[PDB]
Design a protein around this nucleic acid. Structure first.
Ligand SMILES: [Mg+2]
Ligand SMILES: [Mg+2]
Ligand SMILES: [Zn+2]
Ligand SMILES: [Zn+2]
Ligand SMILES: [Zn+2]
Ligand SMILES: [Zn+2]
Lengths: 162, 162
DNA sequence: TTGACTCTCTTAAGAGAGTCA
DNA sequence: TTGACTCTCTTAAGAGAGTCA
C-alpha cells in the first residue's frame, strides 16, 4: 500500500510465506562445461498455495493483502521490487527468473528488468560461459545453443549481395 | 496444388521484384569490437511497395500471385523458403532476419527456423564475438550487452539461500 | 489479376482485474 | 478477510485471411 512501512510489511509477509514453500534443488548448466546447484522455493501446483497467494493462470499467480480495509494485489513475483522504479528507459520493469523456473518465488532468483532483458537471458551462455549481464545470470539459458535452422540464406538468381 | 516449377516461378518473380527495392548500406557490429557492412533491400515505407506486395500490418507484408485463376498469398519474407520443410522439432518455421531489419527482404539476410531460434538472435554476441548458431549470425544482435537491470536478487530477512 | 487497405492470430517471457463463497 | 477460481492484456519476434473495385 501507500506507506513505505506498509510496503516493507508486504515484502516481509511475502518472504515469510514463500520461505515455507518447498525447497527444490536443481542442478543447472553454468556454461563452460560446469554445473551448479540452485535451491528454488516452489509454489504448490494446486491450491492451497500459501497465505495471500492465488493462481490467475497456468503459470501465473498473484499476492494479495488487505491494508486500510482495501485489497491490494500484485503479480506474485513483483513483490520484492515494490520499492523500485516500475519502469526503465520507458519500458515496464518485469520480474525476471534467473533460475528459469516460473513456480519459484525465491527472491534470490529474481531480478527486475525490462521484458527484453528478461527474455534475453533464455539464450545467455551463463556465468561460466561468457555471460555479460551486469546483474549476472545464475545459469546458462535453457535455449542457448546452435539452434535447429532448417534453411539458411540463399538466392536462386544473382540480384543480391550480403 | 502448385507444382515445383510453379513454386520456383513464384520465388523467381519475388526475387526479381525485391532486387529492385532500394539497397541501403548499413554499418553493423560483428562482435569482438569489429564492424562490418550489410546491404539491405528495403521495402518502401508506403504504397506502392512493388508488384505483388501489400502491407497487412505496421511492419508486416504479404506477397500475392494468381495462378490458374487461384489467388495464392504468403508472408512476404517466407517466399524464399517455399521449397523447404515448414516445421522442425514440432515447431513452425519462421522467417528470421539475420540483419534485424524488418523492412529488409534480401534473402541473403534471412533464414528459416523456429520462433525461439529467431528471437534468440537478438542477443547473440555475433559472428566475431562468439556466435554458436549453426547458421551463423551476420551481426551482433541489437540487444546484446550488459542490460539495464533495475534491481538484482535480494532479500530483507534470512529466509532464503541461493 | 491486382493494389491497398481491413481484420485477427501465434509464441513465450511477462501482466491487471472480476466473480463467487 | 481470505481463498479459489474466472477472464483478458503486453511485448516484439513472427503469421493467415477478407473486402472492394
Ligand atoms: Mg525470464
Ligand atoms: Mg528475428
Ligand atoms: Zn528458482
Ligand atoms: Zn547472462
Ligand atoms: Zn537486411
Ligand atoms: Zn548467432
Amino acid at each position: 500500500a501507500l506507506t513505505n512501512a506498509q510496503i516493507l510489511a508486504v515484502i516481509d509477509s511475502w518472504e515469510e510465506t514463500v520461505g515455507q514453500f518447498p525447497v527444490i534443488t536443481h542442478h543447472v548448466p553454468l556454461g563452460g562445461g560446469l554445473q551448479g546447484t540452485l535451491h528454488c522455493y516452489e509454489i504448490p501446483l494446486a491450491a492451497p498455495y500459501g497465505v495471500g497467494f492465488a493462481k490467475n493462470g497456468p503459470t501465473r499467480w498473484q499476492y494479495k493483502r488487505t491494508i486500510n480495509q482495501v485489497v491490494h494485489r500484485w503479480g506474485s513475483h513483483t513483490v520484492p521490487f515494490l520499492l523500485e522504479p516500475d519502469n526503465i528507459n520507458g519500458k515496464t520493469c518485469t520480474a525476471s527468473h534467473l533460475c528459469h523456473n516460473t513456480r519459484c518465488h525465491n527472491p534470490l532468483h529474481l531480478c527486475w528488468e525490462s521484458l527484453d532483458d528478461n527474455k534475453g537471458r533464455n539464450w545467455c551462455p551463463g556465468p561460466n560461459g561468457g555471460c555479460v549481464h551486469a546483474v549476472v545470470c545464475l545459469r546458462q539459458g535453457p535455449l542457448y545453443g546452435p539452434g535447429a535452422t532448417v534453411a539458411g540464406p540463399q538466392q536462386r538468381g544473382s540480384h543480391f549481395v550480403v
